[PDB]
Amino acid sequence: MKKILLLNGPNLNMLGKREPHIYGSQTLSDIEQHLQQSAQAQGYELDYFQANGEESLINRIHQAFQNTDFIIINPGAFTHTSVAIRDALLAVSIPFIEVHLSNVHAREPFRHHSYLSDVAKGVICGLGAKGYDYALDFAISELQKI
Amino acid sequence: MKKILLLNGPNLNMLGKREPHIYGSQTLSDIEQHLQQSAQAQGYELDYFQANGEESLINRIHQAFQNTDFIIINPGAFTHTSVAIRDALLAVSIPFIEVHLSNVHAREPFRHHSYLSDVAKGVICGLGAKGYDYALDFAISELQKIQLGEM
Amino acid sequence: MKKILLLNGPNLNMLGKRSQTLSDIEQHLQQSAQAQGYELDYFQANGEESLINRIHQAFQNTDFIIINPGAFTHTSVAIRDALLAVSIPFIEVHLSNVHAREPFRHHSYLSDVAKGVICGLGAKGYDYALDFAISELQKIQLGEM
Amino acid sequence: MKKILLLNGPNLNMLGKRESQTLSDIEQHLQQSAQAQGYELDYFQANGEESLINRIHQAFQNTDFIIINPGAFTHTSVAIRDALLAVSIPFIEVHLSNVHAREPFRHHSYLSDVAKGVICGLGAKGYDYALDFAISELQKI
Amino acid sequence: MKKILLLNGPNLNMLGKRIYGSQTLSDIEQHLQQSAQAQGYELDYFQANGEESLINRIHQAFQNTDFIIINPGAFTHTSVAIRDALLAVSIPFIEVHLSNVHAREPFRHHSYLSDVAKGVICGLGAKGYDYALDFAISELQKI
Amino acid sequence: MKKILLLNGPNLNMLGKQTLSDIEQHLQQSAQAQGYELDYFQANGEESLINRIHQAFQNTDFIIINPGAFTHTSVAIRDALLAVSIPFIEVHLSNVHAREPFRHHSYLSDVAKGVICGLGAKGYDYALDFAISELQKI
Amino acid sequence: MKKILLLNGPNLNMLGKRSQTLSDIEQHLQQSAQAQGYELDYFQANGEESLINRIHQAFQNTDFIIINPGAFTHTSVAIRDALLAVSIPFIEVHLSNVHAREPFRHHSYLSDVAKGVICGLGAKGYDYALDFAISELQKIQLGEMMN
Amino acid sequence: MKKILLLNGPNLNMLGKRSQTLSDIEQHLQQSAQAQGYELDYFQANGEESLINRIHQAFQNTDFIIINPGAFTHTSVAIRDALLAVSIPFIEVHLSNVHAREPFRHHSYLSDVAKGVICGLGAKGYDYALDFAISELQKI
Amino acid sequence: MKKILLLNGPNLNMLGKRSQTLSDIEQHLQQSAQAQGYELDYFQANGEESLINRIHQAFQNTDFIIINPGAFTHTSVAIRDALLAVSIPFIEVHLSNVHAREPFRHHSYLSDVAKGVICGLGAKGYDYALDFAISELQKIQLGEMMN
Amino acid sequence: MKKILLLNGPNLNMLGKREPHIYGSQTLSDIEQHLQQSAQAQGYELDYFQANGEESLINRIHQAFQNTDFIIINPGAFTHTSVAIRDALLAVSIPFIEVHLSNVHAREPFRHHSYLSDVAKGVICGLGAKGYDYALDFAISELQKIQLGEM
Amino acid sequence: MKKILLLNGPNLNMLGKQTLSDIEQHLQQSAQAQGYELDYFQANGEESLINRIHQAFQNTDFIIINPGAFTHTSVAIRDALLAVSIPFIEVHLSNVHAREPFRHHSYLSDVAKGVICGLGAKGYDYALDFAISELQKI
Amino acid sequence: MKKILLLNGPNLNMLGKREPHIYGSQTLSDIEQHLQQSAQAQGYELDYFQANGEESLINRIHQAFQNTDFIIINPGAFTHTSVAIRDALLAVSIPFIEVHLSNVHAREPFRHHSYLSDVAKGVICGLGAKGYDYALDFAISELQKI
């Protein structure tokens, strides 16, 4: 069974804020469960992980080496600052798609640069949580073509 | 009924025409037909247009004013040069998603800048033709919220 | 005789559509020029080819140009070169204050070669440009006299 | 009886032989024209920020619109920008020459982004247009 | 029969109507076509003031034209679209400019075409087109 | 109730090796003297600092932070502070403007209530006074 | 007896006119310093000449300066040089947070040579600056006794 | 007959107060000029208005200017424009070497329009400027 | 008994996994140093906190540091400050030539305060760094003897 | 009579010497001889010189003062670094055409800047050895205009 | 056999006025200690240095070069090294990154096999070790 | 009796040779002779040298080591490009003054930067040949300080 790994960077654990399930908002837990179940329904295994530091994220990326076939990652702020995470993804040779919930290009100039975009298979920005859904569909289509 | 407009910019008509294919045998027409059929199958209308110049593209955008509810656009090279198209999209106040077949961030540095990305609802880059399918899916989700709001 | 050409760039045709429209401005300016004794032609287009062709057509028959290039102010070296090629003096006009918007709108490929620039005074900016254009043409007429 | 204040910055007092018609000519012309329309127009010129800023502060609560050609200070004076913002009086920036056609340092202004509008390169007529606009704005109020 | 396409961008139609002389764009087009044919080559020419017209002509040359000589005019500094059109049809080209672009404003120092052209000739007036044709033919002789 | 959190970034534990502990204890002492509770924390990594910031969500009323080197590199910490919506003041013992150019930029300054730089340990004293004054207004 | 000079730059005289005024701050600070045994003079002007002359006048008789240069923090190399010429330590104060405003307000010709900078804390910033100045002078005084 | 104007900008009055003062330089230059049959006026101020007004006052009656604008060399477009307005040739002088200081002191709004610039030679810089000014007035 | 600390940053643990491994290098350098009479400790981590904590722990007991910071050379002001805080001279080592890659790898927050930098010489770069560290310590020891 | 001076800068002497060829068996000497023979056959004088340093090149430029009428120069790497050669060419007031075998715009960004291109009559880049032939053709046409004007 | 060429640029002859000669002789000694031949050359101008590089074409296997000031200004020397296709290692006695900003850029670093900077004369020793190492994996 | 070295860089030998005249009939040789005669008349020794390349100039600078007390140099275009000459001057520890005939700040933007001005005792630009006379006067005044 092919495996996909979902990675979320700093502060993404805070999604939903106060009482998320009171007006249609959602937590990271909701998103992780949704993607995991959806991948399983298609016959694929999907693992997920979230952390607020480079060491934790890099260690998880290294752990995926030789057992994971595709990665979906929203690095959060590390998108703009982490050359170390870029190098971790390059070191394990696993294709990945970069996802951002908000439109980074519409925010501060320092968010217009990514240390992952140029080496990612593709990037989806500004479509909210649905962006993860599209990334999962693409990941599976890539795994099917092999 | 709600309507979606698919817009493709300069050189996109060359898809599938290059011999040593980059994406494959698929042509722009294949993508246009596929998206229109998918939209109609879901109860939505979808028009499509492609041109290699700003005037043609801008005139089509203006023509969409007050009759089109969402736009899916792959501006091609104009994403890096066209403030005119940016202003046309803003002038008609129709939300849009920017799509690119290739990963613009993996090419020349000048392709890293866009006059549309910051005002687009979202951007999908590097996922080939599938990118248009995701854009259509998102467009429909937005139109559904609009329809509900009109109730 | 002595003729003036009003040129409006991309998206200006959308004025008052989303109360004064582009047509309202064009007709008003043309009538104002006529009352002052001058013939004013007008044209608007959303592309460089259409605009450049109109500029070329003005060569040798038009004496002054009033132009609001719209977004092309920031991108069109081609229109700059068209205006320079025909040697017709011009004033650049903008309805909104370009300096109060995004940084990329702070640069113009026309401002440095324009006789002058008027920005942020709405439609009245065109009236001032017309007044100046006429003053320049009067000097030309007397000079050839 | 609304009031308009005309302000001219450094070196404008030298108009005439500086790189015809003097500043005095322009000031008289504008004052008389404003008066003919039923408006009062005061004018002032100085070569320093303290003098100009003090005049701007003095206009607070008694002046309805400002027409200003800050001269070289358009490119260097954040202080005058802040004085104009502090008194909350709408203003139009005027330049006799085309600043965009000169040295690169003259391409930037600390007033343009907060001015109601800017007129550059039309000589003294620029002041006439600024006055017409000022009056039109006051007629609205 | 190998074919060469001469492309001229915005404002080139103003040549000889206003720097270089009485010679017009038509003069150059005819002269270059005559010279090409006299050497056993076919040459088409086209001029337009917009990206759409130029890009459409470039697409039309796909698979039937072997070399392009182009003076993009101002579009050399602004048109990524024309750059991509030339790359999409895979036809080698030489960029020509009558005036020396490096001796003018700083913004004319940048180009979206020069780095993908076979070569560039700038500042030699109308003779630049003659040299471009000579090079095109010499290159086609290789094949 | 009236809770203030003092946060110190990487390398501040090396102070005097006054010491960091001297500063932490003095601010706690002064906060207590005015009827406020103050907690303090210091760490050398973003994960540890971000986790402490998240832990303060909805239970801490004001933050006093000297991010150390992270002032110039951590967008992640900026986002953690924005995520918890707790007002804060940025403090630096040394005058960052008098040091290398890369220290002239802060990812926190524009979203902080204010910044105090160059007054040594006294800067923390003033930051605490300000925090209390802000909380009394609310 | 030690002396502190409070300097305020262009437009600060407009405080509370657009409820605390510049005068309120000046009087508050002077009263605070005097109550602690320190003399304090204050001055405000909208021009470089006036401010520079006042700075020169403080040479050899003033022990610390608290200055809110207003807009001149971003443009006045002349005031920077005046403060350096008289060798009097100073603290730069700003009511609003300059880092949260236009990019051009992010640069200062005084910050790098100031003892310290306080920005965005409102009028309280002046109080902290005064406290620091006095705390510094008190250490100097005790040092002189023990020397 | 011919007249030279010596101008000094902000903070120059502090020279020798932190042995030779500004006064010593002003008096020395005036005496040297008068001894050579030339008239020389001098002025110093810490603001643009004062300096610009003195420059305007020299219009059509002063033949050469020697100016040490102090910090205004880096910030005053106004003084640049005042000197251009009166069309009087000038030499820019600086006691210290501006190029050896902070990067912001490497730019000048006067240097490109000055006849020449002398920097880093201390008070002697003013002597050389005076010598040049006189040689210029001699060929006219 | 002088001591040298070998530090390796993010992703260095992947060496030879994509034949010589990081452990091969660590063991080799420790054996070489200790055969020369010098104690050598080694450590590797993928995060700033772990690396910084190890650097602080070296304070007052370590005489020289050999560090390949990995990607952190381009991003970590925090590690720069940790090394400066402990006042231990260090040599920066990189297996690949950082100047032959992307433009962003041309900048470092460590190179300007390092004793020296060795870049692009593969694993042997660590050997040269160790030789230099020992050379320095050997000159210091002889100096102490002759004094 | 009119004279043309052909100047070649640093490393040009390596032409046709690299095992794997870049341009061909053609050497610097071949080009020098070809141009000199061509110029002479048309009735013009042509000197040629090549050196790897500024002093040698500048001295040759000074030597050309008042006796040379046009210069064809391939400055090699010095086009990006030599203000001294720029000033030498300006000091002698001899018009010149800058030539480069390879396309300087298709290489590293630092090669996009030149201290000579802005003051050259024209520039030819990327056409190999033929670039020199075109430069010679133009130079002779310019010299003919001068001779014609000599009445 | 294998030949290595040591090149030193402008002003390096002023060393100690160890000396430049101390370094040249030490590398020659160490090269011969492993059966390799090593030539050395120093000059204060581009023409002299470039001519020596051209002279090494097809007879020299590796170059060790400290371009001195030319590291920051000479595109011509970069192109000479590329023209002769001889791999090289760049060396600097002082730490260029710790000096003026203009010394932070090198026209050789991106095309060199490696760079050693700030280790004084020993940097040359290591550069030689590397050169010999490279000539053996072959 | 303490020696001064006058150094002139690339293209200075062209002085007084271009007919459409810029400075005048005066040549580089005239300035050299004039400055040397003046120095000697004041009880000082003065050597002069001019060359169009860095190697020639740097070698002359090195030769002045330990026998020359002050340098007057007009580096010509090398002021904008030669880090090598800057380092040669620093290596010999000889104080120098930089001189230029024309006003380098009134030309192209690239002429605003120098690799020599910041380490020179002072700079004189735009005063033509007179600048050399002032430089000599200053050099002597500095030597008298010793």
Q: Does C111 touch chain D (CB under 8 A)?
A: yes
Q: Residue A69: what residue type?
A: D
Return the amino acid letter for I116: G
Distance from CA of D48 to the nearest CA of H (A): 4
Whole-number Cα distances in Å, A11 to A28, A53, F50, G44, I40: 10, 10, 8, 46, 39
CA L140/CA L146 separation, integer angstroms: 10
How far is H109 from chain L, CA to nearest CA, in Å? 10
| Contact assessment for residue J33 and residue J81, using Cβ atoms and an 8 Å cutoff | no
Residues of A with catalytic roles: 23, 100
Give residue H121's Cα distance to chain centre: 14
* Contact assessment for residue A117 and residue B105, using Cβ atoms and an 8 Å cutoff: yes
Shortest CA gap L142–chain J (Å) = 31
Which residues lie across from F7 on neighbouring strands?
A: F41, F65
| Beta strand extents in L2-95 (DSSP E only) | 3-8, 45-50, 70-74
What CA–CA distance (Å, rounded) separates B55 from E52?
A: 9
Report the alpha-carbon distance of residue G14 to residue L117 in Å, rounded: 45
CB-based contact, B100 to chain C, within 8 Å: no
What tokens appear for K115 in the block? 């760079």
Task: Give me the residue from J103, J120, J121 closest to E119, CB to CB.
Answer: J103
Method: X-ray
Asked whether K46 and J53 are in contact (CB, 8 A), the reply is: yes
I46 assigned ligand-binding residue: no
Chain J interface mutation, best of K44, K47, K71, highest count of J Cβ atoms under 10 Å: K47
J86: annotated binding-site residue?
A: no
Residue H134 phi/psi, 5-degree rounding, is: -65, -40
- Other chains touching K, judged by 3 or more CB pairs under 8 Å: I, J, L
What residue type is assigned to position D39 of the chain?
Answer: Y
By the 10 Å C-beta count (0-12 exposed, 13-18 middle, 19+ buried), K106 is classed as buried
At E127, which helix (H) or strand (E)?
Answer: helix E127-142
3-state secondary structure at position B12:
helix
Could you give the C-alpha distances from A60 to A92, D92, G91, in angstroms and in order? 11, 60, 48
K37 vs K29: CA distance, rounded Å? 9
Q: Is there a contact between L136 and L71 (Cβ–Cβ < 8 Å)?
A: no
Please, do chains G and I touch (3+ CB pairs < 8 Å)?
no
Dist CA L48 CA L64 (whole Å): 11
Chain L residues in contact with H121 (beta carbon < 8 A): 97, 121-122, 124, 134, 138
In order, the DSSP letters of B66-86 are: TT--EEEEE-TTHHHH-HHHH
Say if CB L62 and CB L7 are below 8 A apart: no
Please identify which residue in the block is written with the tokens 């200003």. D68
The count of other CB atoms within 10 Å of the CB of residue J102 is 16
Question: What Cα–Cα distance (Å) separates residue L65 from each residue in C70, L88, L93, L98, L144?
Answer: 66, 10, 8, 18, 20
Rg (CA), chain D: 14
Query: Do H117 and H92 touch, CB atoms closer than 8 A?
Result: yes
Residues of H known to be catalytic: 94
Q: In the numeric block, which tokens belong to residue B72?
A: 């899916």
Residue H17 CB neighbours (<10 A): 12
User: What distance in Å separates the CA atoms of residue I48 and residue I54, rounded to the nearest whole number?
Assistant: 10
Residue H38 neighbours by CB distance under 10 Å: 20
| K40 near L CB under 8 A | no
Provide DSSP, chain J: --EEEEEE-TTGGGTTTSSS-SS-S--HHHHHHHHHHHHHHTT-EEEEEE-SSHHHHHHHHHHHTTT--EEEEE-TTHHHH-HHHHHHHHHHT--EEEEESS-GGGS-GGGG--SSGGGSSEEEESSTTHHHHHHHHHHHHHHHHHHHHT-
Exposed, middle or buried: residue D29 (CB in 10 Å: 0-12, 13-18, 19+)? middle
Q: Do B and K make contact, counting contact as 3+ CB pairs within 8 angstroms?
A: no
Q: Rg for chain I (alpha carbons), in Å?
A: 15
CB proximity G81 to H under 8 Å: yes
Contacts of K46 in chain L (CB under 8 A): 54-55
CA distances from L1 to D4, L34, L39, L40, L140 (A): 74, 19, 11, 10, 11
Alpha-carbon gap, residue L113 to C75, rounded angstroms: 32
User: Any chain H CB within 8 A of the CB of D109?
Assistant: no
Beta strands in chain L (DSSP E): 3-8, 45-50, 70-74, 96-100, 122-125
Range of the structural domain that residue H60 is part of: 1-140
Compute the distance between CA of residue L51 and CA of residue J58 in angstroms, rounded to an integer.
10
D39 backbone dihedrals φ, ψ, rounded to 5°: -120, 150
CB contact under 8 A, C76 and E77: no
Q: Please, where are the H alpha helices in chain D? A: 23-36, 49-59, 73-76, 78-87, 125-140
Comparing CA positions, the residue from I13, I34, I11 lying closest to residue I24 is I13
Q: E136: domain CATH number?
A: 3.40.50.9100
Nearest to G74 by CA among G108, G100, G46, G102: G108
* Residue L111 structure tokens: 């002429």
Strand order from edge to edge, sheet including F114-117: F37-42, F3-8, F62-66, F88-92, F114-117, G116-119, G90-94, G64-68, G3-8, G39-44
The set of residues, in sequence order, having a beta carbon less than 8 Å from that of B141 and lying 6+ positions away, is A130
- What is the SS3 assignment for K41? strand
CA-nearest of B80, B81, B82, B100 to B90 is B82
* Structure tokens that stand for F44 in this block: 């050398």
Cα-to-chain-centroid distance, residue K83: 16
Phi, psi of J125, rounded to the nearest 5 degrees: -135, 130
- Cα of G139 vs its chain's centroid, Å: 20
Cβ contacts of D101 on chain C, cutoff 8 Å = 111-113
The residue assigned the tokens 């490696």 is K114
Nearest beta carbon to residue C112 from set D100, D132, D136? D100
- At residue A99, φ and ψ (nearest 5 deg) are -125, 140
Cβ neighbours around B119 below 10 Å, total = 17
Single-letter amino acid, residue J113: H
Q: Which amino acid is at D67?
A: I
Q: Point out the residue among C50, C75, C105 whose CB comes nearest to the CB of B55.
A: C50
Say if the Cβ atoms of H17 and G59 lie within 8 Å: yes
Half-sphere exposure of B142 (CA within 13 A, CB side): 22
Nearest CA in chain J to K75: J77
The amino acid occupying position F85 is: S
Nearest to A53 among F46, F58, F107 (CB): F46
Number of domains in chain E: 1
